């Protein structure tokens, strides 16, 4: 019998392959459709088990798709016959057929895009009636009914996007009243007892999504159902499922942003959201906080002259209570950075906490990228607070204790030293975090800003020594750049970053400090000045506006030379240049002589012969030879 | 400072309003100790606070949670929190060490006699004290191991009382009959083992029977539910309705998964002591998966990570009989919404790894079930493409093993099914091209804007939507794409490249499954000797659809001689060569009758993508 069924299905599918013939009138008979559905259900049930003979598998597989296409084609004629559509949907969702794109491609292009405000309200009401209790329809069917309900509302919203306060004639009073009665006004005596059926969570999520969309896009139509909406949202918060609970929180936050609520509920919801610690639904909590917090001052005004809001102390309260859990601190800081203006006033109780927790958030040994981003973001937040204070003063305010500033500065220096990215240079062979960190460090040390601290600041001896004077680092710097084995990228990146930070700090030092500390500067830079790697020399000597991000930070060599009164440094540099040129390492010698000449021309007279010999021997010779070879090619 | 001194003297002379004031002062000191947690004056406060707390703690247990009872409960809570919150590190200037014996003994006695809401914090305090104060408290680990052994021994009787023999107005039971402390114990025990090393060798032998019995423990209601479900031939999942206390059930499963994690941790080196217990492990895993409540997703995630840790130890051979049972989606995932929305890739990836490792000894039915399940997984609508890529890679890997089946008909059928699944995926990808292009452009513009994102209506951003946005136009966002930072075009190209690479291997494997004697090859060119033969009318359709859908996906790479690298790049050219080489390995008659039918469609297609 199955061979006969397959042949009949194939013949019927072959028929109606040319719809522009008026020969499809045979699809209007209902007995034929029912018989087709029965035989199709039998064939599909036989397929589900490995019962068919091994010769009839693929033909039946293809016949099932042919049958579904035939059913959709029959459905296409007379779209308004919704009973057939509901029966087909029930069959699909009841594990009787196999879904095919044709059903959705018909739903779209016949119902969702129907060019009539009528035939939408009828469909919405019928879908709600099927959803509105009545049983006789499993949960999957309700979800698939919401699948058709929501797109109609979305399309109506899209079609009425214009200036003259366009009204939604589709959203008449009757449809809103029916929605209220069937979803909002209905107070479930014990919806938990109904949890003993599968897939209900998906229907609950769908109704929550529908309500959220309706609020967000037609807030002006819920003035007669505000209270019912509040009761609905609050009742659904009790759900034990994480995602449903957070969706309810998002809905209530939407309403709070779009409406007025007494401060008790907003405070309670905010406090409850802050205590949240489960890593699931993090994005939902982020969205809820973003929607709620900005309008908090309007919802929670404070007396004039009062700088201790309850909602301001609540985050501090949780920070104190749950300091043992790192996830809570990460979440609270993530919330805090996004809104610096609101907490600018209360920074008094937050700045020290941020500075202390900076070390905890990011581990010096091996932190994660998100941790680094968060630490840099909090750094930028406090910098923004300081800039706001300075601008307000220009246009006895709290200031951080010097101990906190020192700890922050040393931590930032170490973080820049141990950064992953490499500072861009003109000589790099063929970066945002490093740029931001360097810009922040430069901005902080300005004179009116914390720049008053440089006088007592040393040159970070521990970090500078362990990064530059290391024996492994020394030999790698003295190693051949050509050999990849002695070209550890991470170490060289660390050298470049430490060189940049020492340059920035020296740009702010005092001449007397440089003269006094000359031996330490010599000890630190002696290893690097002999390097044959172009990047190191570019770091030491070159200083270009393009790569500095609009910062006038003169090179280190120029600064130290200008510090010398119009000495030992000049003789030392001349000796380095002489020994480098003699050894054949022109890269260091040329740069050193360039800097010296830019300082005082009188010293290159005894160096002219070496420069001339190098030019006549290697550089110009190889350049001309290369261009001659290119011409030959 | 005066407030602290007056509060301290009031407390000292103590031995509603007065009790409320004392609670406020004590818990405010708890909150504000950050200014005094570390300092040279700590010894004085320590020695002056310990006696009062010890004297107060000697009072009888209080079970009520209202009025003065609640007041004293809060007093004790925010008094004992100091011990945990204090800097109890092992630094040289530690001053608690010399005065720890009496306090830790009293805390152990409290754990013996206190209640849930107190014993939990007491055991946590004991664990944190032992983590740092082991220098001189090393001799009292015997009492702690004896107490935890007693708890593990009485777990059975408490479970029996709670299941078999079974807020202000409530009465708080004794902590000895609570599942929370039992569930929290394993982490503390592991930490203690990590700290010390002198009391690990002999105690593991005593622990092993206890963990074995705890894992073997079962509820009569759930057991009979499973038995009747098996009798009916079906499988029962969820929570048995006969259970009157669902929360107790959930706590029991949480304790079970914690014990399973402890077993996985202990199996690292002490596996020799647990050799006899291996055969019951898979059945217990299946039972726990079936009985796990839908709501408790964290328990399921912990169970998944535990199974990953156990399978990594090369003990896979024992899981073979239950492979068929685990394939069922109801057992592996369940009805949980959060699980279905977040953790499906993890479970299916671990199952794919397990199947891949032990592929050698799989029966035909298991092969068929895996092929069906992962072909269905390939067509899923997950937001990304990593899940699809994993499913495709598993299918391609299993293609090689599918060709070793004794029956050639089944092997040919399964290979053809894999090809059909790939063709359907190509069609699905073809269906989403304009949406992907539009979303790529929109993401580029949005990233260019560089402004904070707000979830509110905006006139500057008209809500454009199309066919592919049927169920993605609602305000709620389960996971923001911004965190992913994914470009649909790039992901589609990656998936397409992976599928194209696997196609050649699949066709080569199919090349070695001809049924001997099916067709006559008396005279044939040497070029057409090892190719695949014997195609029916239904497989030519599959091959033609494969070609026609594969050719049209090259739009994602958007005169012709192109002597220099222009228009089409090296990657596109090599992908085209790989795609064309696939059709060199079929019967010449099939080649003729396929391309004689496909040439007009190809000619039409060239007008849109000239690189074809």
UniProtKB/TrEMBL annotation, chain B:
Coiled coil: none
Stated role: Serine/threonine protein kinase which activates checkpoint signaling upon genotoxic stresses such as ionizing radiation (IR), ultraviolet light (UV), or DNA replication stalling, thereby acting as a DNA damage sensor. Recognizes the substrate consensus sequence [ST]-Q. Phosphorylates histone H2A to form H2AS128ph (gamma-H2A) at sites of DNA damage, involved in the regulation of DNA damage response mechanism. Required for the control of telomere length and genome stability.
Subunit composition and interactions: Associates with DNA double-strand breaks.
Family, as annotated: Belongs to the PI3/PI4-kinase family. TRA1 subfamily.
Protein known as: Non-specific serine/threonine protein kinase
Organism the protein comes from: Chaetomium thermophilum (strain DSM 1495 / CBS 144.50 / IMI 039719) (Thermochaetoides thermophila)
Source lineage: Eukaryota, Fungi, Dikarya, Ascomycota, Pezizomycotina
Parent-protein residues present: 1 to 696 of 3893
């Amino acid at each position: 019998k199955f061979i006969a069924i397959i042949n009949t299905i194939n013949m019927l599918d072959a028929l109606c392959q040319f719809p522009t013939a008026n020969s499809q009138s045979w699809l209007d008979n209902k007995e034929h459709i029912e018989w087709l559905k029965t035989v199709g259900k039998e064939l599909e049930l036989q397929q589900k088990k490995n019962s068919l003979t091994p010769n009839l598998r693929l033909p039946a597989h293809q016949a099932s798709e042919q049958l579904m296409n035939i059913l959709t084609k029959a459905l296409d004629r007379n779209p308004n016959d919704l009973d057939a559509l509901f029966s087909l949907v029930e069959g699909i969702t009841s594990d009787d057929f196999r879904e095919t794109p044709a059903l959705l491609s018909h739903i779209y292009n016949k119902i969702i895009r129907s060019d009539s405000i009528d035939f939408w309200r009828i469909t919405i009401l019928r879908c709600l009636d099927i959803y509105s209790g009545k049983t006789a329809s499993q949960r999957m069917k309700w979800y698939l009914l919401h699948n058709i309900v929501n797109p109609i509302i979305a399309m109506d919203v899209m079609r009425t996007w214009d200036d003259p306060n366009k009204a939604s004639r589709l959203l008449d009073r009757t449809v809103i009243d029916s929605i209220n009665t069937k979803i909002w006004k209905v107070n479930l005596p014990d919806p938990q007892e109904d949890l003993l059926q599968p897939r209900v969570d998906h229907t609950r999520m769908e109704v929550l999504q529908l309500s959220a969309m309706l609020v967000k896009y037609r807030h002006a139509l819920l003035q007669d159902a505000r209270k019912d909406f509040i009761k609905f949202a609050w009742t659904y918060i009790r759900l034990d499922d994480v995602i449903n609970k957070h969706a309810a929180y998002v809905v209530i936050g939407y309403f709070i942003a779009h409406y007025e609520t007494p401060a008790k509920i907003v405070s309670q919801i905010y406090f409850s959201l802050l205590k949240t610690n489960q890593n699931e639904g993090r994005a939902l909590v982020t969205q809820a906080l973003e929607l709620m917090a900005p309008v908090m001052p309007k919802r929670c005004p404070f007396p004039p002259g009062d700088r201790n809001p309850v909602w301001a102390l609540a985050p501090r309260r949780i920070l104190a209570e749950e300091s043992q859990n790192v996830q809570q601190m990460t979440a609270i800081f993530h919330y805090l950075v996004r809104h610096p203006d609101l907490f600018y006033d209360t920074r008094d109780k937050f700045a020290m906490l941020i500075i202390q927790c900076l070390r905890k958030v990011a581990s010096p040994p091996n932190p994660s990228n998100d941790n680094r981003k968060l630490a840099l973001n909090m750094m930028w937040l406090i910098w923004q607070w300081e800039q706001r204070r300075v601008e307000s003063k220009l246009s006895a305010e709290f200031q951080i204790p010097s101990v906190g500033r020192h700890k922050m500065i040393r931590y930032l220096v170490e973080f820049i030293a141990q950064l992953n990215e490499r500072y861009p240079l003109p000589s790099a062979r063929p970066n945002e975090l490093c740029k931001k960190a360097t810009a922040l460090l430069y901005n902080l040390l300005q004179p009116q800003y914390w720049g008053d601290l440089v006088e007592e600041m040393d040159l970070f001896p521990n970090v500078t020594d362990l990064v530059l004077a290391g024996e492994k680092s020394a030999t790698l710097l003295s190693a051949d750049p050509s050999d990849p084995e002695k070209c550890d990228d991470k170490l060289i990146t660390s050298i470049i970053n430490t060189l940049q930070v020492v340059r920035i700090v020296l740009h702010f030092k005092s001449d007397r400090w440089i003269l006094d500390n000359m031996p330490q500067i010599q000890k630190i830079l002696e290893k690097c000045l002999k390097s044959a790697n172009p990047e190191i020399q570019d770091c030491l000597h070159m200083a270009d506006r393009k790569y500095d991000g609009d910062r006038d930070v003169k090179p280190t060599i120029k600064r130290i030379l200008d510090a010398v009164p119009e000495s030992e440094l000049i003789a030392w540099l001349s000796g380095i240049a002489t020994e480098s040129m003699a050894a054949g390492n022109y890269v260091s010698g040329i740069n050193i002589l360039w800097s010296l000449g830019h300082r005082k021309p009188s010293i290159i007279d005894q160096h002219i012969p070496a420069i001339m010999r190098s030019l006549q021997s290697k550089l110009a010779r190889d350049h001309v030879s290369h261009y001659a070879a290119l011409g030959h090619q | 400072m005066a407030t602290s001194l007056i509060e301290d003297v009031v407390k000292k002379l103590s031995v509603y309003t007065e009790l409320k004031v004392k609670a406020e002062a004590a818990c405010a000191l708890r909150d504000s100790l950050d200014h005094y947690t570390a300092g040279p004056a700590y010894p004085a406060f320590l020695k002056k606070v310990m006696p009062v707390f010890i004297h107060i703690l000697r009072q009888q247990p209080v079970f009520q949670t209202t009025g003065e009872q609640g007041h004293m409960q809060k007093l004790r809570n925010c008094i004992l929190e100091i011990l945990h919150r204090l800097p109890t590190s092992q630094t040289p200037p530690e001053h608690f060490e010399p005065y720890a014996h009496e306090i830790v003994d009293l805390l152990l006695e409290l754990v013996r006699t206190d209640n849930e809401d107190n014993v939990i914090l007491c055991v946590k305090i004991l664990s944190d004290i032992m983590r740092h104060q082991h220098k001189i408290m090393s001799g009292k680990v015997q009492t702690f191991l004896n107490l935890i052994q007693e708890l593990f021994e009485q777990l059975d009787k408490v479970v029996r009382d709670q299941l078999d023999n079974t807020q202000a107005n409530r009465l708080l039971p004794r902590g000895m009959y609570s599942f929370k402390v039992l569930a929290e114990c394993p982490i503390i025990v592991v930490s203690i083992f990590q700290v010390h090393r002198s009391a690990v060798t002999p105690n593991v032998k005593a622990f092993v029977p206890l963990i074995k019995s705890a894992l073997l423990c079962q509820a009569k209601a759930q057991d009979q539910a499973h038995r009747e479900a098996a009798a009916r031939g079906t499988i029962h999942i969820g929570v048995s309705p006969n259970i009157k206390n669902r929360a107790a059930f959930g706590d029991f499963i949480t304790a079970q998964v914690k014990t399973m994690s402890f077993l996985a941790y202990l199996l690292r080196q002490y596996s020799s002591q647990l050799s006899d217990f291996l055969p019951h492990l898979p059945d217990i895993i299946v039972r726990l998966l079936r009985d796990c409540p839908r709501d408790k997703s964290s328990a399921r995630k912990e169970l998944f990570v535990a199974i990953r840790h156990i399978i990594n130890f090369n003990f896979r051979k024992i899981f073979l009989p239950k492979i068929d049972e685990l394939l069922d989606e109801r057992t592996l995932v369940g009805d949980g919404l959060t699980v279905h929305e977040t953790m499906r890739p993890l479970a299916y990836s671990m199952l794919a790894d397990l199947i891949h490792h032990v592929r050698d000894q799989l029966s035909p039915e298991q092969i068929r079930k895996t092929v069906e399940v992962y072909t269905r997984n390939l067509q899923d609508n997950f937001p990304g493409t990593s899940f699809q890529t994993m499913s495709a890679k598993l299918l391609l890997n299993m293609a090689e093993c599918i060709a070793r089946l004794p029956n050639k008909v089944d092997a040919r059928h399964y290979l053809i099914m894999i090809l059909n699944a790939i063709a359907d995926k190509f069609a699905a990808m073809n269906r989403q091209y304009p949406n992907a292009v539009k979303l790529s452009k929109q993401y580029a513009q949005q990233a260019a804007k560089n402004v904070p994102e707000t979830y509110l209506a905006d006139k500057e951003n008209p809500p454009d939507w199309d066919e592919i946005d049927i169920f993605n136009a609602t305000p709620i966002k389960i996971s923001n794409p911004r965190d992913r930072a994914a470009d649909p075009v790039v992901d589609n190209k990656f998936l397409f490249r992976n599928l194209m690479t696997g196609l050649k291997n699949t066709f080569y494997q199919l090349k070695s499954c001809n049924i001997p004697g099916a067709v006559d090859l008396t005279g044939a060119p040497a070029h057409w000797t090892d190719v695949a033969y014997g195609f029916t009318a239904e497989e030519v359709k599959v091959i033609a659809k494969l070609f026609r859908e594969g050719a049209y996906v090259f739009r994602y790479y958007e005169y012709m001689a192109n002597f220099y690298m222009v228009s089409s790049s090296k990657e596109e050219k090599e992908l085209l060569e790989t795609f064309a080489t696939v059709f060199h390995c079929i019967d010449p008659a099939t080649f003729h009758e396929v391309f004689q039918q496909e040439i007009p469609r190809l000619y039409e297609m060239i007008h849109e993508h000239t690189a074809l």
